[model samples]
Target: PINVAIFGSTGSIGTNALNIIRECNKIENVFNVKALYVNKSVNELYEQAREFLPEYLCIHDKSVYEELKELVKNIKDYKPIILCGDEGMKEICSSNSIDKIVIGIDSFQGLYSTMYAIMNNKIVALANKESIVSAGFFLKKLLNIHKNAKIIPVDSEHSAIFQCLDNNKVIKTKCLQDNFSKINNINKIFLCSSGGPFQNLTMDELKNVTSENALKHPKWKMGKKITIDSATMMNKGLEVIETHFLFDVDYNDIEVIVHKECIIHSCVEFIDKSVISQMYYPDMQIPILYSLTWPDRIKTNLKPLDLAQVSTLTFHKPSLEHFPCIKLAYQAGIKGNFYPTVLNASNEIANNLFLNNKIKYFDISSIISQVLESFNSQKVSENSEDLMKQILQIHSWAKDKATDIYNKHN
Candidate 1:
């Protein structure tokens, strides 16, 4: 059985990952959970620890560690080596006992651990788009150095491409057969977005949208942060940048089309005038499982798409004026330095401000635009540490800028 370690075991992706692990048990010797980590949420963390009985468990929030300290004292079978903070997450990622890693952490914080795992030549089921968006170029460069390091995209769009290419095993087998040129045939990859709850909102409507209105997603149930990102189409923007690095495709090769149905997760167009796309229920578990067991198909109990229930799939062009974040991502992607990191960091801060009632929903884009305009003008080095320093510096500056913009508008 494959041994898997999961980071962010308490969030939406994390809980769904647990569901996948539980389902994997019925697959008759396929995979098993080795360890789990969470960035707080002691109650949920403790519950997962009890169920998985992993060799190691980490809760990042030290304040809540005392509550869990007394809770896990009695469990026998296997006493988890509990740890905390960045060091704790690093331990799990670099652990010898872990055969595979599921990086489901929510924010850009997932960047370091995921990068560490890929450098060590571990298989990573990557769900954190923020991390990939921030350091896609650097991470891809690092992955190229490791002969064994392979990233299976756990996000829906990338996973759909991965699934569609299942029959075309030539990409892998041909590489071994010395026919390396064949990989070039698989050209275009199309990412599908649900257009979010504000798909048809006018500029005036979007400007006055409240937190509750933005959070009311039409189809998917997700975390507040991601849901808000979806409303502004920033989530799709991040995914676009993510696809570029994940598949080593140029920005021109990757396109994002707004699909309201969301059934067709993504489409991959090959050179032979053949377009292959994967469709299923809009669920994270499916992609998560696909990442875990790549190059091999496993039966899952996830609800298959019912044609009668969902008859038509509609597509439209993305409105750049309405969603400036997508444009920002493309601009950052093409620039390819520390610009993407700044964009991501600014978005995070802006999203937090919007959620906390400090700014209107439209102000999210405004703050991000200001941050990018100022940050991108600086000379940023390509080194990771320097990139991080620029990001942090811009993040603090953006927070202040956001507050200033908010006060001015109010």
Candidate 2:
């Protein structure tokens, strides 16, 4: 049996992975549910723990250890190892027992776990975007070195691009050391977006937007932060960076289109100009299942797409004048050092402020834009550990600066 561990087991991606695993096991019991980890949701974790009966169950918030134990202690002799915090996640992801790691830990901390798994030669199906968006230059350098470690992207757009570009080609990784080795004659990547809930609104109309209205994302049901990012189209911006690093494509080669239908996950152009795109029902299920079962397709009982019923799928250029984050992400990614991290950290802070009612909707982008311009860019260090530490320090600094900007605004 192929053993697997899922970090952030209580969240959308983790829970979805567990669902897919449950379905896959019904046909052939090949995947061993070795470990389940959660950052702060012991209630959901305990439920998942009892259902999966994994070898280890972990929680990041150490304060809930006793409650987690009490809930799981009577689960039919399920004595899984209980661990907490980063040490717990690190121990689990880097362990030899974890043949594959599903990273959805919701922060750049996921990147730390990713680096751990990479160093130990594990398959990573990553859902945490900040890791790559913030520090993928370091990640790519390290990943290319580890060679045996392969990162299978689990984001909807990236997975579609990976499918069209990689899986659709050599069928899968031919080399253990270089899974993404086939990225040679690429042309362009059309990264798709739903254009969020306000695609038609004018820049003046956006000024009066409320967090409640902004959080009402039309296409994907996600966490509030991400749903808001989608509303502001910052999610697409971050994806721009992710797409650039994940595929080794130049920023100029990547473009964002308003795919209102959300059916076309993404499109890739070969050098010959013929385009390849991946499509299905607009759900995370296919992406999750594909990441786990890369190079192979599994039979899923999902409802088949009915294009007639879907009726229409539309595309257009994103309104960059309105959504400045997209432009900011390109600037940061092209800047190629501490800028991405600062952009991410500042945007996160600004978004949080908007979500909490401390800032206006458009204020999110302006504050982020101001933060990016305010940064005194500098040379990054060589040491990976120092690189990561410096990234974190700058992240904190950016967050503080964004906060300062917001405070000074009033």
User: lDDT for each of the candidates?
Assistant: 0.77, 0.83
lDDT per residue for candidate 1 within 296-320, as digits (tens), equals: 7688766777988898889888999
The 10 consecutive residues of candidate 1 with the worst lDDT sum are 173-182
User: Model 2 reaches what TM-score against the true structure?
Assistant: 0.95
Model 1 misplaced regions, further than 4 Å: 166-184, 218-220, 377-410
All-Cα superposition RMSD per candidate:
3.3, 2.2
Q: Could you give candidate 2's per-residue lDDT for residues 168-240 as a string of tens digits?
A: 5544442222334344457898999988877899978888887888775443457787888988899999999
Q: lDDT score, residue 356, model 1?
A: 78
On TM-score, the candidate that comes out on top is: 2
TM per candidate comes to 0.90, 0.95
Angstrom error of the Cα, residue 320, model 2: value is 0.8
Cα lDDT over the full model 2: 0.83
